């Protein structure tokens, strides 16, 4: 019943005889399945998750230099040194400055200088290696029970592709899903930047000129290639300057245009995955196929409304007393349109039922219940121009 209202919806019907029915599930797409004397079911891919992801390398895209420290020596007094030169969180550089009387030296000449600053990462992106088989999918199966828009969650993986799922009152449904997504995780790296994510070529990833931490480094601070975001300036032999090179965030986004983008709605992998499944409905059964026909009268609780796919939704309440019972439903004298919410049943007189049916093109008659007060509603499904 979940599909009712979703524009990206498919109505897949099982080939007259054959138990199997092939469907394609993707994010923001719903699928309605029908088969002769079988319940109508609604499928939706709710989440895709990359499990057991091995971090290959982590890159710095925005950095900050702090704790700047300098040491100089007087001319001929050798090379200066700071302890920081041995601290791997620090970026250092040796240069020469003009020394003399006015800057604290007995002699006039080129005195060695050394400038150290603490390289701190403000923003990073991590590249993850994901094993195709480790991609978990979450499918929700909702039966067409007439009850408000109840659903059995089911998890599959390209390995555990085939699962039997039991639906309370309808029996079991066998699902055989394919390891055939539009995703070659082989030689691809899942590049994650905050809330954005993409799938990119391994060699391109490793060849990026940015400071990095290896996959192995357990939340380290010893960024390799710090030089790629740091610059030392000493043009007049008066002073050495250390300067940060500015956020590569937007630059990265631009580099990543001709890449497979992955979206992250509510901080999860909710894109580029599509699952081609096969469905066996031989163990499925219509709920209340044993119940008797409704005798009483029906009321129209909400005005009949048309869905985006030409189908119509009728919310009705039972006034009679036979419940639990089968609702008599039909769409002059000869049958015309088809039912989507197959074998509509009443559970309680108080609880209304939602019946989805496909009316025929043009004028039709929606007849709900049996006499007296048997509802004889009118529909108009006009034809469409190019």
């Amino acid at each position, epitope marked *: 019943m979940r599909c009712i209202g979703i524009s990206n919806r498919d109505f897949v019907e099982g080939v007259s005889g054959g138990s199997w029915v092939d469907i394609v599930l993707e994010h923001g797409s719903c699928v309605t399945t029908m088969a002769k004397n079988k319940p109508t079911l609604d499928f939706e891919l709710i989440k895709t998750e990359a499990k057991q992801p091995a971090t290959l390398r982590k890159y710095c895209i925005e950095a900050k230099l702090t704790n700047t420290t300098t040491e100089s020596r007087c001319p001929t007094q050798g090379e200066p040194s700071l302890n920081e030169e041995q601290d791997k969180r620090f970026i250092c550089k040796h240069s020469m400055v003009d020394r003399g009387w006015g800057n604290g030296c007995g002699l006039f000449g080129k005195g060695g200088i050394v400038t150290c600053a603490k390289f701190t990462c403000k923003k990073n992106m991590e590249g993850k290696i994901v094993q195709p088989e480790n991609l978990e999918y979450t499918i929700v199966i909702t039966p067409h029970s007439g009850e408000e828009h109840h659903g059995k969650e089911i998890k599959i993986t390209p390995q555990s592709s085939t699962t039997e799922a039991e639906l309370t009152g309808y029996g079991t449904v066998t699902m055989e899903c394919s390891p055939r997504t539009g995703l070659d995780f082989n030689e691809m790296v899942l590049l994650q930047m905050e809330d954005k994510a993409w799938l990119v070529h391994r060699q391109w990833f490793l060849d990026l000129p940015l400071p990095w931490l290896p996959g192995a480094d357990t939340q380290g601070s010893n960024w390799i290639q710090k030089e790629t975001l740091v610059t030392f300036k000493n043009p007049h032999a008066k002073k050495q300057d250390v300067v940060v090179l500015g956020s590569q965030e937007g630059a990265m986004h631009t580099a990543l245009t001709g890449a497979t983008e992955i979206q992250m709605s*509510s901080g999860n992998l909710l894109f580029t995955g599509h699952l081609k499944c096969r469905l066996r409905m031989d163990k499925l059964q219509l709920k209340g196929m044993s119940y008797s026909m409704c005798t009483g009268k029906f009321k129209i*609780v*909400k005005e009949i409304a048309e869905t985006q796919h030409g189908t119509i939704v009728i919310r009705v309440q039972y006034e009679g007393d036979g419940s639990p019972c089968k609702i008599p439903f039909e769409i002059k004298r000869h049958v015309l349109g088809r039912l989507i919410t197959v074998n509509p049943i009443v559970t309680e007189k*108080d609880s*209304p039922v939602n019946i989805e049916a496909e009316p025929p093109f043009g004028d039709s008659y929606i007849i709900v219940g049996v006499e007296p007060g048997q509802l004889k509603l009118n529909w108009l499904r006009p034809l469409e121009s190019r």
Partner: antibody, heavy 121, light 110 residues
Framework: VQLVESGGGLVQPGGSLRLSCSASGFTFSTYSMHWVRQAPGKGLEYVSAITGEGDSAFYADSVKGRFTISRDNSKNTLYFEMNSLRPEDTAVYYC???????????????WGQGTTVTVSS | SEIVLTQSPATLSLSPGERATLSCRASQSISTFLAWYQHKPGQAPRLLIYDASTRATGVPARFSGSRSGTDFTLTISTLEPEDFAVYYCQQRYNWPPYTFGQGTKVEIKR
């Protein structure tokens, strides 16, 4: 399933205040959260709302400009950082929440106990 | 345009055991998106009915809701002493504001 509000108190006119609403017993991110107030002897006034994800916010003209709704899904807390307080904002402020699948829309809700805000000199 | 909900009567004086009928009028069609609340002083407002006719979880059956275009009705069949409160209607049509009615007070007739 509950909502606990706090931060109510006496404030001087032109003054400012921040209200909190701590959510428990549910996935806070799945609920559109709302602020409803009731001035003494007056009815319920729907004042503001925020999406489950914090993305988008709504404010009734009566508060639009001075009041800012916000939320922390890590800390399961809704806030009504209310600045530029006037005597007419004196009321019991309730937070309400409902499972939302589309922006601010909801069916069944959850209400907190209320917090009194007094704006007086 | 702005949706206004109009509640009538302002005060409803009845005896326990009687049938109470409360009306709420929308300024334009709000379809079926109407909710009813029970408000007791020194208590948080309580949701009774949503979608004009659906009883909330645990709400007793004496509470009934019905629609007729822009005119909505809250019915309480056998009034019990704890049903003596203030009743509000609320619109949940489309987009906010999800505004309220001015309220109806259900008082004991003596």
């Amino acid at each position: 399933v509950q909502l606990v509000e706090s931060g109510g108190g006496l404030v001087q006119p032109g003054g400012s205040l921040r209200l909190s609403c701590s959510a428990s017993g549910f996935t806070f991110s799945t609920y559109s959260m709302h602020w409803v107030r009731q001035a003494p002897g007056k009815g319920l006034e729907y004042v503001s709302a925020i999406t489950g994800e914090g993305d988008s916010a709504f404010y009734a003209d009566s508060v639009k400009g001075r009041f800012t709704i916000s939320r922390d899904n890590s800390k399961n807390t809704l806030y009504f950082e209310m600045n530029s307080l006037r005597p007419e904002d004196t009321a019991v402020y309730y937070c309400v929440g409902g499972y939302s699948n589309f922006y601010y829309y909801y069916t069944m809700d959850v209400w907190g106990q209320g917090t009194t805000v007094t704006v007086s000199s | 345009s702005e949706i206004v909900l109009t509640q009538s009567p302002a005060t409803l004086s009845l005896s326990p055991g009687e049938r109470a009928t409360l009306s709420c009028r929308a300024s334009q069609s709000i379809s079926t998106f109407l909710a009813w609340y029970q408000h007791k002083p020194g208590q948080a407002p309580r949701l009774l009915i949503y979608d004009a006719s659906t009883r909330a979880t645990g709400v007793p059956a004496r509470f009934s809701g019905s629609r007729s275009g822009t005119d909505f009705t809250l019915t309480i069949s056998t009034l019990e002493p704890e049903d003596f409160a203030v009743y509000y209607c609320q619109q949940r049509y489309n987009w906010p504001p999800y505004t309220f009615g001015q309220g109806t007070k259900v008082e004991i007739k003596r």
